[PDB]
Design a protein around this ligand. Structure first.
Ligand SMILES: Cc1cn([C@H]2C[C@H](OP(=O)(O)O)[C@@H](COP(=O)(O)O)O2)c(=O)[nH]c1=O
Ligand SMILES: [Ca+2]
Length: 129
């Protein structure tokens, strides 16, 4: 798997973001995670966490997995990195997302994320308190 450039266009919520990728605007959905929707508990905090991660980044990258690159809604499915740090991992480690939507063939970073989730639950963070 490999990292490719992208630039912020705009925040959407905890697990979706609008990025410019290969010079085209696209909505991206983070692989292997589920943040609460804005209107749910820890939804606002998830959206704030991801928004901040992308605003503060000098460099954003997207990394597709081996399988499907777009979902049925036309959203890109990727691991996204902010200054080298994986958003997907960072959300789970903070208890602001669960591991979820693990489909065969797009699951390269599953166990990395599950390790992060175990550590978040151990610490009873956010969604696990
Ligand atoms: C994360 C992810 C979501 N999805 C689809 C499945 C879900 O379909 P349904 O909308 O039919 O439930 C939906 C969940 O996204 P959200 O969690 O953003 O709503 O997006 C994928 O198909 N592939 C994926 O890798
Ligand atoms: Ca969600």
């Amino acid at each position: 798997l490999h990292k490719e450039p992208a630039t912020l266009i705009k925040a959407i919520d905890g697990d979706t973001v609008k990025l410019m990728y290969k010079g085209q605007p696209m909505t991206f959905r983070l692989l292997l995670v589920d943040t609460p929707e804005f209107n749910e508990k820890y939804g606002p905090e998830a959206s704030a966490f991801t928004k901040k991660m992308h605003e503060n980044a000098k460099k954003i990258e997207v990394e597709f997995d081996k399988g499907q690159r777009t979902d049925k809604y036309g959203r890109g499915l990727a691991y996204i990195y902010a200054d080298g740090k994986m958003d997907n991992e960072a959300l789970v480690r903070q208890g602001l997302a669960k591991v979820a939507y693990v489909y065969k063939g797009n699951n390269t970073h599953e166990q990395l994320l599950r390790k992060a989730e175990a550590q978040a639950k151990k610490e009873k963070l956010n969604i696990w308190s």
